[PDB]
Design a protein around this ligand. Structure first.
Ligand SMILES: [Zn+2]
Ligand SMILES: [Zn+2]
Lengths: 223, 194, 199
């Protein structure tokens, strides 16, 4: 278990349209997986095969929840579109979202110049060496998370590559990312856009909502 | 596999304008300017690049004779076998090229300068309307990164002629007034495994 | 379409030239020394706006000739999209066909631009009542632009050259009623294809 921590910085703003008009203030682990998948497959790194299968977890790609001036990552509040920091009391909020109207199109985007958390918990050191290579490509050539990647949006660049061994710190959890616990309430929607079948599947799995322990969406925090 | 890494560096030769697209940042400038320049929240000026590259290659490759999808209309669909539709994408398959925004190297208050434009009554020979608009100075340096994956050998040459077209035609807005006359430079490299 | 008429204009100043600085920062940082700075690049070369001069020349002459042209110079006056100046220079719908570049000088500010004393003299007591400093481009400076008509519908070069004769007689820039801005253009056209760069 050798997890690669970091704080990514948005060099260019990102756009995550979710559902019913609402957007996503920070990018999620889904986007991280997908982008690392692309980087791996386009560089023919072997691990790419497993990344197709979503029901996996030898490398769990947790979300890109933002970090603050209080150091500690922002955390999802009880039924709120805001993420008050644990230490200190600053909110992330929908003040990062901006309605953009460009050449007829009308989408929304989160402003750039922010600092988010990189946390890829590697369960077995088997794939940690390939994890070094994917964070090498991110360290040099950036990683583009979100919509309009070919147009240039979502330019995240890592600023620290701290490869730290971590424990599953199970205890007793907090659901730091809305997860599909059987038939919970919040509707969660994903995608498996596979190249070499041209197959785009809008998969949906209803579950719980972040703001309320087999190892470490599906994240957990001490409470 | 193989992937191209065309790092483009622009230098502005005549004043640049690309309009601001965030509604809130626009309206928080419509008190002062009437045409604010597109700006990041890191106070850097970003220009759309993919559309310009695509448009230039579409126009050029069409005039040469090669069947390309003109996507400058309201077609809302290209096809999948075009010379540009392989490179700058199609509505079923992603692009081989992933063109990035031409972000600046300097911040605003060092590149962007408010300006005055006029409308002159042809008989009175005096100003009818006056308006403010922002612009990027000449000599200002911008950078981008084209990321053609699965290179097709002609791809680099097509991207650099596209660049020659956007040096003749211009990037940004107000291109018939004299704005946006630029000068690119290419330093390409083929990234591979590690 | 398949070809592009590439007009190459070279202009020589036959009189002092003034076009005012549009940049508020550059103007306000010049009011310390000069009351009327000229339009200058950050590459220290002098810009003159050219499209509007060509469009004003053709609209005035074409209204005079009896042709039907729109007046895109009045307050709240829209273009037509049916006139020949709406085809050559553009409307609120269809883009213009001529992409008229700026008239950028071939020299820098230190070799063409001089500060100059200007006066207001009382008519009765024949003595100066106001003094101010302007910048002016000297006589003999060479500026270069490039008009580029896409879809070169023939009569383009004739209309552009007639407009350049009008600008030669009338002037380009500011203070055009005092003797400033008298120029001499030199056309060198061409018809190079759109596909020219494709290797
Ligand atoms: Zn805090
Ligand atoms: Zn007209």
């Amino acid at each position: 278990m050798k997890e690669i921590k970091g704080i990514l910085e948005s060099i260019t703003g990102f756009s995550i349209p979710l559902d019913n008009g609402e957007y996503a203030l920070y990018p999620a682990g889904r986007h991280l997986r997908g982008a690392i998948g692309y980087i791996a497959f386009n560089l023919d790194l072997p691990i790419s095969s497993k990344f197709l299968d979503f029901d996996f977890d030898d490398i769990i790609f947790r979300d890109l929840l933002p970090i603050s001036k209080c150091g500690k990552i922002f955390y999802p509040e009880k039924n709120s579109n805001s993420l008050k920091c644990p230490s200190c009391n600053e909110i992330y909020g929908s003040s990062v979202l901006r309605n953009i109207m460009a050449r007829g199109l009308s989408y929304k985007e989160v402003i750039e110049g922010k600092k988010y958390r990189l946390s890829i918990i590697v369960k077995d050191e088997k794939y940690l060496n390939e994890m070094e290579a994917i964070i090498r490509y991110i360290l040099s050539y950036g990683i583009y998370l979100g919509n309009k990647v070919s147009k240039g949006y979502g330019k995240f660049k890592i600023k620290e590559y701290s490869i730290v061994d971590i424990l599953p710190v199970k205890d007793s959890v907090l659901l730091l990312s809305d997860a599909i616990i059987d038939n919970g309430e919040k509707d969660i929607v994903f995608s498996k856009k596979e190249i070499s079948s041209s197959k785009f599947e809008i998969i949906r799995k209803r579950g719980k909502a972040k703001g309320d322990h087999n190892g470490f969406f599906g994240e957990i925090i001490s409470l | 596999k193989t992937m191209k890494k065309i790092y483009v560096t622009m230098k502005t030769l005549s004043p640049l304008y690309t309009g601001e697209v965030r509604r809130e940042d626009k309206e928080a400038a419509q008190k002062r300017v009437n045409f604010p320049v597109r700006k990041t929240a890191t106070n850097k000026v970003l220009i759309p690049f993919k559309g310009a590259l695509r448009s230039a290659l579409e126009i050029m490759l069409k005039a040469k004779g090669e069947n390309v999808c003109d996507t400058g209309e309201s077609r809302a669909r290209p096809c999948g076998r075009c010379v540009t539709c392989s490179l700058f994408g199609s509505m079923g398959r992603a692009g081989r090229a992933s063109v990035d925004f031409l972000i600046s190297n300097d911040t605003k208050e060092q590149i962007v300068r408010e300006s005055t434009h006029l409308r002159i009554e042809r008989q009175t020979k005096s100003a009818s309307d006056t308006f403010k608009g922002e612009e990027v100075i000449e000599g200002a340096t911008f950078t981008a990164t084209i990321t053609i994956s699965n290179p097709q050998e002609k791809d680099l040459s097509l991207i650099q002629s596209a660049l020659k077209f956007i040096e003749e035609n211009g990037i940004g807005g107000w291109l018939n007034k004299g704005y946006g006359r630029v000068s690119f430079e290419v330093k390409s490299e083929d990234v591979a495994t590690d």
